[PDB]
Design a protein around this nucleic acid. Structure first.
Length: 101
RNA sequence: UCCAGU
């Protein structure tokens, strides 16, 4: 499909995430926009998996605390084009059933 | 608006 699967390092990943962007932003943008902070070790857009069109948000991520702390110290509260940005540490490894089994 | 993907 797209992107690349999470690394085999979830046993110590910093798991920072990023959201709140616009319905007009795109993942190639956030990939490069956040790559400068050190390591955009992952990025995703779980918009849907049956209609793939919500695109109202994204999930940029980091795996090292030094680049993750800067990423939120400089993107939390920013403005893409007229709304706010959000970035903070995750709370789960991944959703348990958003795609059923 | 916490991932459903190499």
């Amino acid at each position: 499909m797209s992107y690349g699967r999470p690394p085999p390092d979830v046993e110590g990943m910093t798991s920072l995430k990023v959201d709140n962007l616009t319905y007009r932003t795109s993942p190639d943008t956030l990939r490069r926009v956040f790559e400068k902070y050190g390591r955009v070790g992952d990025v995703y857009i779980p918009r849907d998996r049956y209609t793939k069109e919500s695109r109202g948000f994204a999930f940029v991520r980091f795996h090292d605390k030094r680049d993750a702390e800067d990423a939120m110290d400089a993107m939390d509260g920013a403005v893409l084009d007229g709304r706010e940005l959000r970035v903070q540490m995750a709370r789960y490894g991944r959703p348990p059933d958003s795609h059923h089994s």
